[PDB]
Amino acid sequence: VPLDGGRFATSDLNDLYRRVINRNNRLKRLLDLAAPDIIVRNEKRMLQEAVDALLDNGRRGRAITGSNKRPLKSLADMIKGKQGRFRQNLLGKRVDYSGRSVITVGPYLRLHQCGLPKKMALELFKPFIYGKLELRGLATTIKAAKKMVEREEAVVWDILDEVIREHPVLLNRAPTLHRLGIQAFEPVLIEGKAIQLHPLVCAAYNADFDGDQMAVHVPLTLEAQLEARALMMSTNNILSPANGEPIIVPSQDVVLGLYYMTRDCVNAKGEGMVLTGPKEAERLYRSGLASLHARVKVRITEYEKDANGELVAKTSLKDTTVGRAILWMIVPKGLPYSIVNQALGKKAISKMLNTCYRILGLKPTVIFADQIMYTGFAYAARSGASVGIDDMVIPEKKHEIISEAEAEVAEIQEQFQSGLVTAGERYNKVIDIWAAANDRVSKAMMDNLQTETVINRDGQEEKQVSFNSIYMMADSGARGSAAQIRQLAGMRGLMAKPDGSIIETPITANFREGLNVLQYFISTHGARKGLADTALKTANSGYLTRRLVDVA
């Protein structure tokens, strides 16, 4: 390809062919000149080496290079390897009618919808716009329609809404690990430049919203649209192919909403009152007459299909909360009431969706998922579940445990100089007693965090499960675990060295107080190894799946 200037592209096949033809012409010239056998033998050797370089360069000892000692690519170098015609241009190709932009949440959507930017769907569904404009007679030829579209008149938007009405698009994230990484959504035109994505499918995509992008593809033919709707639509991908667990499970905000809503404390704005239905419970709560965490007796009607597919209702009076009564209003007819009458974490919601899918079907499951997401977001916003610095309460019996453990360490250190304990068992026991102090501190922390909340029964005090926001979003399963809360309020632990030697003095400070100039450097070893393990050891785990796919 000619570039700017008289020079040409740094082609390698042409250079190798130049070398081979030059050597071959020289050999043919020397064959007629009756050159001495040594010279023609050397030239034949050079021709053989040049041809071997053209066929598969580098298969000999040293590879030839064009410029700056860069080994140029021969014919085999563009058939083999990761940059060959097989893995780069045949098994995977660049694709027309494709897009790429950042993603945002937009929780107002439904399970089968996404948000394409209005200035992107115009570029994607452009030939469809041309066809409909020619059908309606607004344009005359392809050139006129193209000019009208690029000028973005007042009616091309009114035509774009017709080509996109029920024409699904494929949203694909970059690492397509499993088959749920490509799903089909019915587009909804929005003003902006970010592809909105339903919050439920983020678990399947493994797509946070901290700056990642997704690729949108347009099924062109009729069969492609029908496959996108019947097979790849997100409403038909609620079950993980890996295991029978649901994959559209609420994650980290709907879970917190449904955990704050479906939980009781022993006191209320109105506690002993008896309600006559979930609708009246919602009316009571929204009016500010009773708290969401009351302990009432609402009269409910739970349907049951224990017959051969017939829904027979049974009404009773169960001791529940106001929040559980409100949540029951969205549960479809056919589920037992002993599914929301608890403290719904994340496993509880996943099992709720699984039972709903097994009992009712797919359409009620999709409706239930949308309603759960809506009522989780609403009653999570109405809670204001913040996180301060007082929530991470350090147990008072922490520095006492530290002093006792350090006294034991000093005693063992002194015993080391007495010759009773060598540099073996002494190191082992000092590590073990530091671990003992660690578990005692963590147990004191997790006993002060949840059950240590004295509340008044209005007759006297009693205990309950805490409303400590850190513990709330740790118990609900929204985000966090025992390790994170242990490292925030308790002690951090025993951060070892990269070789494998556990540090003699474990970090006794957490991220609620400070960290010393040296404890941070100790933690940096483990943090850097954990960051490097991903970057330079996901390659083998991504090669394993390639081998597994190619063998099967």
Partner 1 sequence: GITKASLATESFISAASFQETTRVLTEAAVAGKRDELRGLKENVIVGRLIPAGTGYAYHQDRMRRR
Partner 2 sequence: VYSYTEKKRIRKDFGKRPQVLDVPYLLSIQLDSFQKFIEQDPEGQYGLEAAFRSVFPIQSYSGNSELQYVSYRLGEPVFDVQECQIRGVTYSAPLRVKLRLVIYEREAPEGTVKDIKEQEVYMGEIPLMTDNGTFVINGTERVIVSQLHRSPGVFFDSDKGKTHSSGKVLYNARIIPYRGSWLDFEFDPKDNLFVRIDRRRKLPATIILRALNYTTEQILDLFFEKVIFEIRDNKLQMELVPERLRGETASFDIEANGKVYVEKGRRITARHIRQLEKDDVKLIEVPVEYIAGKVVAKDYIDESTGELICAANMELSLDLLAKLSQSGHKRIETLFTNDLDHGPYISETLRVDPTNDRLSALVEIYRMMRPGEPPTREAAESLFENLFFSEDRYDLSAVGRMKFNRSLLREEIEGSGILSKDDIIDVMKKLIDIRNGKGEVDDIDHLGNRRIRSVGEMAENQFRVGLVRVERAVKERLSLGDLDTLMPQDMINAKPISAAVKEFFGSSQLSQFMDQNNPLSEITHKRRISALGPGGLTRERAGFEVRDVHPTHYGRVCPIETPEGPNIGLINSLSVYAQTNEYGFLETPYRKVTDGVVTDEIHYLSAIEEGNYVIAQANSNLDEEGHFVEDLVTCRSKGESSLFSRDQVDYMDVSTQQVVSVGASLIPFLEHDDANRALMGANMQRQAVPTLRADKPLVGTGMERAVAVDSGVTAVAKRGGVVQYVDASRIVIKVNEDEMYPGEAGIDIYNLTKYTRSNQNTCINQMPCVSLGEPVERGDVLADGPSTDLGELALGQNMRVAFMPWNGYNFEDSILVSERVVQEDRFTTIHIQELACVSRDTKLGPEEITADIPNVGEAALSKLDESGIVYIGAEVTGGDILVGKVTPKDSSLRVPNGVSGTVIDVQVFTRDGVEKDKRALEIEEMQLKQAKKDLSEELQILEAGLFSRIRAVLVAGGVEAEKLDKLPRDRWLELGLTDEEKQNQLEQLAEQYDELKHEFEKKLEAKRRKITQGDDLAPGVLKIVKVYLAVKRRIQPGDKMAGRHGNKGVISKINPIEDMPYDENGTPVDIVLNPLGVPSRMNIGQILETHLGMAAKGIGDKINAMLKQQQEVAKLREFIQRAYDLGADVRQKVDLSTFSDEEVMRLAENLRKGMPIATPVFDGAKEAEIKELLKLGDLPTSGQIRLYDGRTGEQFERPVTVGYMYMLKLNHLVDDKMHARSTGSYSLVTQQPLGGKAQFGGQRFGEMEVWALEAYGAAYTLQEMLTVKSDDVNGRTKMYKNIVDGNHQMEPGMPESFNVLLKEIRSLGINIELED
Q: Which of 518, 541, 543, 544 binds partner 2 (CB under 8 A)?
A: 518
Output the smallest distance, CB 220 to RNA, in A.
Answer: 24
Q: Which secondary structure element, helix H or strand E, spans residue 473, and what is its range? A: helix 469-475
CA-to-CA dists, residue 120 to 112, 116, 125, 126, 195, angstroms:
19, 7, 9, 10, 9
Tokens (6 digits) for 256: 């917190």
**In 3D, which of 58, 82, 73, 68 has the Cα closest to residue 16?**
73
Q: Which of residues 65-94 bind partner 2 (CB under 8 A)?
A: 75-76, 78-79, 85-87, 89-94
Is 137 near partner 2 (CB under 8 A)? no
Apex CA 225: angle with CA 224 and CA 230, to 5°?
A: 100
- CA atoms of 472 and 491, how far apart (whole Å): 20
Output the smallest distance, CB 249 to DNA, in A.
Answer: 23
Q: Which is nearer to Mg ion, 212 or 513 (CB)?
A: 212
CB neighbour class for 1 (10 Å; exposed up to 12, middle 13-18, buried from 19): exposed
Residue 52 partner contact from DNA, RNA, partner 1, none using kind-dependent CB cut-offs of 5 to 8 Å: none
Q: Which is nearer to partner 1, 92 or 288 (CB)?
A: 92
Residue 488 partner contact from partner 2, DNA, RNA, none using kind-dependent CB cut-offs of 5 to 8 Å: partner 2
Beta strand 455-456 pairing with 461-462: antiparallel
Is 361 near RNA (CB under 7 A)? no
Is 256 near partner 2 (CB under 8 A)? yes
* Most distant CA atoms of the chain, gap in Å: 121
108 Cα distance to chain centroid:
20
Q: What x/- string results for residues 43 through 82 when contact with RNA is judged by CB under 7 A?
A: ---------------------------x------------
Tokens (6 digits) for 65: 């290079």
Is 498 near DNA (CB under 7 A)? no
Task: Point out which residues pair with 313 in neighbouring strands.
Answer: 303
Q: Which residues are annotated as part of the binding site for Mg(2+)?
A: 208, 210, 212
Mutual orientation of helices 425-449 and 482-489 as an angle, nearest 10°?
A: 90
Q: Which is nearer to partner 2, 126 or 324 (CB)?
A: 126
Residue recorded with tokens 């003003």: 191
Is 517 near RNA (CB under 7 A)? no
CA-to-CA dists, residue 111 to 248, 279, 334, angstroms:
9, 26, 22
Residue recorded with tokens 């069969």: 223
Region near partner 2 per CB under 8 A, out of 29-37, 40-48, 119-127, 305-313: 119-127
Is 59 near partner 2 (CB under 8 A)? no
Apex CA 190: angle with CA 188 and CA 193, to 5°?
A: 120
Output the smallest distance, CB 156 to RNA, in A.
Answer: 31
DSSP for residue 85: T
Output the smallest distance, CB 111 to partner 2, in A.
Answer: 14
Is 24 near partner 2 (CB under 8 A)? no
- CA atoms of 120 and 117, how far apart (whole Å): 5
Q: Which residues are annotated as part of the binding site?
A: 208, 210, 212
Residue 103 partner contact from RNA, partner 2, DNA, none using kind-dependent CB cut-offs of 5 to 8 Å: partner 2
Q: Which is nearer to partner 2, 31 or 483 (CB)?
A: 483
Q: CB-based contacts of 197: which residues, under 8 Å, 6+ apart?
A: 103, 104, 105, 106, 114, 115, 171, 205, 207, 214
Residues in the chain: 552
Residue recorded with tokens 């905000």: 253
Q: What x/- string results for residues 166 through 185 when contact with partner 2 is judged by CB under 8 A?
A: ----x-x--xxxxxxxx---
Beta strand 113-117 pairing with 274-275: unpaired
Is 38 near partner 2 (CB under 8 A)? no
Is 450 near partner 2 (CB under 8 A)? no
Is 93 near DNA (CB under 7 A)? no
Residue type, 463: K
Output the smallest distance, CB 533 to partner 2, in A.
Answer: 9
Q: Which is nearer to DNA, 67 or 460 (CB)?
A: 67
Do residues 385 and 376 lie in contact, with contact meaning Cβ atoms separated by under 8 Å? no
Residue 206 partner contact from Mg ion, partner 1, RNA, none using kind-dependent CB cut-offs of 5 to 8 Å: RNA
What phi and psi, each to the nearest 5 degrees, are found at residue 234? -65, -25
Residue 10 partner contact from DNA, Mg ion, partner 1, none using kind-dependent CB cut-offs of 5 to 8 Å: DNA
Residue of minimal CB distance from Mg ion? 212
Is 18 near DNA (CB under 7 A)? yes
Mutual orientation of helices 142-151 and 126-136 as an angle, nearest 10°?
A: 110
Do residues 265 and 464 lie in contact, with contact meaning Cβ atoms separated by under 8 Å? yes
Q: What x/- string results for residues 197 through 216 when contact with Mg ion is judged by CB under 5 A?
A: -----------x---x----
Output the smallest distance, CB 173 to RNA, in A.
Answer: 7
Task: Note the residues at the interface with partner 1 (CB under 8 A).
Answer: 56, 76, 79-81, 84, 86-87, 90-91, 223, 227, 231, 547-548, 550-551
Is 174 near DNA (CB under 7 A)? yes
Sign, Cα dihedral of 475, 479, 483, 488: negative
List contacts with RNA (CB under 7 A).
1, 9-10, 70, 83, 174-175, 206-208, 210-213, 534-535, 538
Residues that bind DNA (CB under 7 A): 3, 5-10, 18, 22, 59, 67, 69, 80-82, 87, 92, 94, 100, 174-175, 534-535, 538-540, 542-543, 546
